[PDB]
Design an enzyme around this catalytic site. Sequence first.
Site, PDB file in Angstrom:
ATOM      1  N   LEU A  20     -25.891  42.142  12.618  1.00  0.00           N
ATOM      2  CA  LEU A  20     -27.252  41.574  12.401  1.00  0.00           C
ATOM      3  C   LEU A  20     -27.230  40.063  12.640  1.00  0.00           C
ATOM      4  O   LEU A  20     -28.299  39.492  12.928  1.00  0.00           O
ATOM      5  CB  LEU A  20     -27.700  41.843  10.963  1.00  0.00           C
ATOM      6  CG  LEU A  20     -28.103  43.271  10.604  1.00  0.00           C
ATOM      7  CD1 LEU A  20     -28.543  43.314   9.148  1.00  0.00           C
ATOM      8  CD2 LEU A  20     -29.205  43.803  11.514  1.00  0.00           C
ATOM      9  N   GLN A  22     -24.496  36.133  11.921  1.00  0.00           N
ATOM     10  CA  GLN A  22     -23.248  35.424  11.543  1.00  0.00           C
ATOM     11  C   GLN A  22     -23.017  35.633  10.035  1.00  0.00           C
ATOM     12  O   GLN A  22     -22.547  36.739   9.684  1.00  0.00           O
ATOM     13  CB  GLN A  22     -23.315  33.966  12.009  1.00  0.00           C
ATOM     14  CG  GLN A  22     -21.995  33.250  11.833  1.00  0.00           C
ATOM     15  CD  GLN A  22     -20.879  34.186  12.223  1.00  0.00           C
ATOM     16  OE1 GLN A  22     -20.784  34.610  13.374  1.00  0.00           O
ATOM     17  NE2 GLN A  22     -20.052  34.562  11.254  1.00  0.00           N
ATOM     18  N   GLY A  23     -23.342  34.653   9.175  1.00  0.00           N
ATOM     19  CA  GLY A  23     -23.127  34.715   7.710  1.00  0.00           C
ATOM     20  C   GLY A  23     -22.075  33.707   7.271  1.00  0.00           C
ATOM     21  O   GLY A  23     -21.182  33.373   8.102  1.00  0.00           O
ATOM     22  N   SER A  24     -22.165  33.256   6.014  1.00  0.00           N
ATOM     23  CA  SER A  24     -21.449  32.079   5.439  1.00  0.00           C
ATOM     24  C   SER A  24     -19.926  32.251   5.471  1.00  0.00           C
ATOM     25  O   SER A  24     -19.211  31.276   5.789  1.00  0.00           O
ATOM     26  CB  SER A  24     -21.899  31.851   4.028  1.00  0.00           C
ATOM     27  OG  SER A  24     -23.310  31.764   3.976  1.00  0.00           O
ATOM     28  N   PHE A  25     -19.466  33.430   5.052  1.00  0.00           N
ATOM     29  CA  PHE A  25     -18.046  33.770   4.783  1.00  0.00           C
ATOM     30  C   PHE A  25     -17.541  34.758   5.841  1.00  0.00           C
ATOM     31  O   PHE A  25     -16.354  35.125   5.775  1.00  0.00           O
ATOM     32  CB  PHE A  25     -17.904  34.375   3.386  1.00  0.00           C
ATOM     33  CG  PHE A  25     -18.279  33.468   2.236  1.00  0.00           C
ATOM     34  CD1 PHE A  25     -17.370  32.547   1.728  1.00  0.00           C
ATOM     35  CD2 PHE A  25     -19.532  33.553   1.640  1.00  0.00           C
ATOM     36  CE1 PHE A  25     -17.704  31.723   0.663  1.00  0.00           C
ATOM     37  CE2 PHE A  25     -19.867  32.733   0.570  1.00  0.00           C
ATOM     38  CZ  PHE A  25     -18.953  31.817   0.089  1.00  0.00           C
ATOM     39  N   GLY A  26     -18.417  35.168   6.770  1.00  0.00           N
ATOM     40  CA  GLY A  26     -18.078  36.030   7.916  1.00  0.00           C
ATOM     41  C   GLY A  26     -19.309  36.808   8.398  1.00  0.00           C
ATOM     42  O   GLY A  26     -20.466  36.356   8.146  1.00  0.00           O
ATOM     43  N   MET A  27     -18.975  37.992   9.065  1.00  0.00           N
ATOM     44  CA  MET A  27     -19.945  38.749   9.895  1.00  0.00           C
ATOM     45  C   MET A  27     -20.801  39.642   8.986  1.00  0.00           C
ATOM     46  O   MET A  27     -20.246  40.238   8.042  1.00  0.00           O
ATOM     47  CB  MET A  27     -19.216  39.604  10.939  1.00  0.00           C
ATOM     48  CG  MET A  27     -20.067  39.915  12.166  1.00  0.00           C
ATOM     49  SD  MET A  27     -20.204  38.510  13.321  1.00  0.00           S
ATOM     50  CE  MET A  27     -19.054  38.979  14.617  1.00  0.00           C
ATOM     51  N   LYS A  48     -22.089  42.317   4.118  1.00  0.00           N
ATOM     52  CA  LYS A  48     -21.626  40.915   4.187  1.00  0.00           C
ATOM     53  C   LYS A  48     -20.091  40.923   4.105  1.00  0.00           C
ATOM     54  O   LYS A  48     -19.550  41.476   3.119  1.00  0.00           O
ATOM     55  CB  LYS A  48     -22.294  40.201   3.017  1.00  0.00           C
ATOM     56  CG  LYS A  48     -22.500  38.698   3.102  1.00  0.00           C
ATOM     57  CD  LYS A  48     -22.698  38.190   1.698  1.00  0.00           C
ATOM     58  CE  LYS A  48     -23.524  36.939   1.549  1.00  0.00           C
ATOM     59  NZ  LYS A  48     -24.214  37.026   0.233  1.00  0.00           N
ATOM     60  N   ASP A 139     -33.380  27.672  -1.445  1.00  0.00           N
ATOM     61  CA  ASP A 139     -33.732  27.772  -0.015  1.00  0.00           C
ATOM     62  C   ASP A 139     -34.858  28.776   0.118  1.00  0.00           C
ATOM     63  O   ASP A 139     -34.773  29.669   0.933  1.00  0.00           O
ATOM     64  CB  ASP A 139     -32.509  28.075   0.863  1.00  0.00           C
ATOM     65  CG  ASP A 139     -32.746  27.796   2.357  1.00  0.00           C
ATOM     66  OD1 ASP A 139     -33.812  27.249   2.683  1.00  0.00           O
ATOM     67  OD2 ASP A 139     -31.870  28.176   3.198  1.00  0.00           O
ATOM     68  N   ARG A 143     -38.083  32.608   6.080  1.00  0.00           N
ATOM     69  CA  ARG A 143     -36.847  33.103   6.734  1.00  0.00           C
ATOM     70  C   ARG A 143     -35.890  33.701   5.686  1.00  0.00           C
ATOM     71  O   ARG A 143     -34.944  34.361   6.074  1.00  0.00           O
ATOM     72  CB  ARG A 143     -36.179  31.982   7.521  1.00  0.00           C
ATOM     73  CG  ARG A 143     -35.612  30.842   6.689  1.00  0.00           C
ATOM     74  CD  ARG A 143     -35.075  29.654   7.557  1.00  0.00           C
ATOM     75  NE  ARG A 143     -34.848  28.620   6.541  1.00  0.00           N
ATOM     76  CZ  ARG A 143     -35.760  27.727   6.142  1.00  0.00           C
ATOM     77  NH1 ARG A 143     -36.904  27.612   6.780  1.00  0.00           N
ATOM     78  NH2 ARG A 143     -35.526  26.911   5.124  1.00  0.00           N
ATOM     79  N   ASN A 144     -36.084  33.436   4.393  1.00  0.00           N
ATOM     80  CA  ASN A 144     -35.146  33.979   3.387  1.00  0.00           C
ATOM     81  C   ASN A 144     -35.837  35.132   2.633  1.00  0.00           C
ATOM     82  O   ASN A 144     -35.144  35.763   1.800  1.00  0.00           O
ATOM     83  CB  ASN A 144     -34.569  32.859   2.526  1.00  0.00           C
ATOM     84  CG  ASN A 144     -33.473  32.116   3.247  1.00  0.00           C
ATOM     85  OD1 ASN A 144     -32.697  32.693   4.002  1.00  0.00           O
ATOM     86  ND2 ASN A 144     -33.452  30.820   3.078  1.00  0.00           N
ATOM     87  N   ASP A 157     -31.409  36.021   1.028  1.00  0.00           N
ATOM     88  CA  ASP A 157     -30.755  34.776   1.513  1.00  0.00           C
ATOM     89  C   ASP A 157     -29.900  35.188   2.713  1.00  0.00           C
ATOM     90  O   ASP A 157     -28.918  35.952   2.577  1.00  0.00           O
ATOM     91  CB  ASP A 157     -29.959  34.047   0.426  1.00  0.00           C
ATOM     92  CG  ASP A 157     -29.535  32.643   0.846  1.00  0.00           C
ATOM     93  OD1 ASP A 157     -30.303  31.934   1.410  1.00  0.00           O
ATOM     94  OD2 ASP A 157     -28.480  32.261   0.511  1.00  0.00           O
TER      95      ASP A 157
HETATM   96  C1  LIG Z   1     -26.735  38.072   4.120  1.00  0.00           C
HETATM   97  C2  LIG Z   1     -27.348  39.077   3.101  1.00  0.00           C
HETATM   98  C3  LIG Z   1     -26.924  40.524   3.314  1.00  0.00           C
HETATM   99  C4  LIG Z   1     -27.181  38.615   1.677  1.00  0.00           C
HETATM  100  O1  LIG Z   1     -26.114  38.350   1.107  1.00  0.00           O
HETATM  101  N1  LIG Z   1     -28.411  38.473   1.151  1.00  0.00           N
HETATM  102  C5  LIG Z   1     -28.702  38.145  -0.108  1.00  0.00           C
HETATM  103  C6  LIG Z   1     -29.606  38.937  -0.863  1.00  0.00           C
HETATM  104  C7  LIG Z   1     -29.941  38.555  -2.167  1.00  0.00           C
HETATM  105  C8  LIG Z   1     -29.354  37.445  -2.732  1.00  0.00           C
HETATM  106  S1  LIG Z   1     -29.683  36.882  -4.385  1.00  0.00           S
HETATM  107  C9  LIG Z   1     -31.188  35.823  -4.079  1.00  0.00           C
HETATM  108  F1  LIG Z   1     -31.644  35.325  -5.233  1.00  0.00           F
HETATM  109  F2  LIG Z   1     -30.960  34.802  -3.236  1.00  0.00           F
HETATM  110  F3  LIG Z   1     -32.120  36.537  -3.474  1.00  0.00           F
HETATM  111  C10 LIG Z   1     -28.464  36.705  -1.972  1.00  0.00           C
HETATM  112  C11 LIG Z   1     -28.120  37.056  -0.687  1.00  0.00           C
HETATM  113  C12 LIG Z   1     -29.338  38.785   2.051  1.00  0.00           C
HETATM  114  O2  LIG Z   1     -30.557  38.732   1.871  1.00  0.00           O
HETATM  115  N2  LIG Z   1     -28.780  39.145   3.198  1.00  0.00           N
HETATM  116  C13 LIG Z   1     -29.501  39.511   4.406  1.00  0.00           C
HETATM  117  C14 LIG Z   1     -30.040  40.921   4.383  1.00  0.00           C
HETATM  118  C15 LIG Z   1     -30.101  41.795   3.363  1.00  0.00           C
HETATM  119  N3  LIG Z   1     -30.671  42.936   3.771  1.00  0.00           N
HETATM  120  C16 LIG Z   1     -30.973  42.821   5.056  1.00  0.00           C
HETATM  121  N4  LIG Z   1     -31.550  43.659   5.921  1.00  0.00           N
HETATM  122  C17 LIG Z   1     -31.762  43.282   7.179  1.00  0.00           C
HETATM  123  C18 LIG Z   1     -31.408  42.017   7.656  1.00  0.00           C
HETATM  124  C19 LIG Z   1     -30.797  41.126   6.791  1.00  0.00           C
HETATM  125  C20 LIG Z   1     -30.587  41.547   5.480  1.00  0.00           C
END
Ligand SMILES: CC1(C)C(=O)N(c2ccc(SC(F)(F)F)cc2)C(=O)N1Cc1c[nH]c2ncccc12
Length: 274
Positions: A20, A22-27, A48, A139, A143-144, A157
């Site tokens: 999908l 890149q990512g902070s700590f890998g793919m 992740k 953040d 986009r997040n 995120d």
């Molecule tokens: C990088 C990864 C997996 C992740 O680690 N997180 C995350 C989630 C919650 C929190 S906790 C917070 F409070 F930030 F939400 C922190 C990181 C994401 O949202 N990601 C992307 C993601 C998830 N599902 C998807 N489906 C399709 C495309 C991309 C994604």
Amino acid sequence: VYVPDEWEVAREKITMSRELGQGSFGMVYEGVAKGVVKDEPETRVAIKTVNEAASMRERIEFLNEASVMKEFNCHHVVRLLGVVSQGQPTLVIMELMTRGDLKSYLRSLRPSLSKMIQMAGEIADGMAYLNANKFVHRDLAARNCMVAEDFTVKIGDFGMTRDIYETDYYRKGGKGLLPVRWMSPESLKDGVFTTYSDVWSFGVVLWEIATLAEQPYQGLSNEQVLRFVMEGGLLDKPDNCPDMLFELMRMCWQYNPKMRPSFLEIISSIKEEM
Ligand SMILES: CC1(C)C(=O)N(c2ccc(SC(F)(F)F)cc2)C(=O)N1Cc1c[nH]c2ncccc12
Ligand code: NI
Ligand code: NI
Ligand code: NI
């Protein structure tokens, strides 16, 4: 260190389909996990990974950061489904949001008050939950925000630039990447991040919904955005912006953090006219 627990899944249960980003700590991958959820034999997942090159310190950093998500139970926050601490690579498995991030979704629509209000309430729902639990996102931006199969918006995120939105971040030399166009005046000036600075960002997200994700402060440089925002400057009303949605934005952009509404106050005002 990190102590394996009930969140541990056997690496044999996860198959990896395609990447999908890149990512902070890998793919980061899209995949399938086996018996990770009740009454559901297979689950479509996001994986992740910790890059195999990464140190011992940074594999344990990763696991302990992602363990924060074990505490969370809000359908409006992307859900952790499992960890694989044992052997290589180190994986965390999560809910798959099939329609990607809210900024790409908005740009692909290049909607009505009701759809914008729904999306806003769902965003405010995850942020209210995070802020109540002492989790300041830092953040918050379209986009997040992630969009599920059923069009539900959830707080996620997708690290911090995936290249795709690299114009959303300012490198403050050594500091690191700052999303300055989403940051509150107290965050820019003093590095103060609170629930009230998340509420400021949410206002920018509402502006992103109303403009189908234009760049905030288009035609100002990163340094001009700093100066403008710290000195009391505000985004303009988007074209065709419904009154209610712009009133909400302005509430969120009070200079004094204490005069901004809480996410709970925002959900109330939204519900009261739905
Ligand atoms: C990088 C990864 C997996 C992740 O680690 N997180 C995350 C989630 C919650 C929190 S906790 C917070 F409070 F930030 F939400 C922190 C990181 C994401 O949202 N990601 C992307 C993601 C998830 N599902 C998807 N489906 C399709 C495309 C991309 C994604
Ligand atoms: Ni580190
Ligand atoms: Ni909901
Ligand atoms: Ni580029």
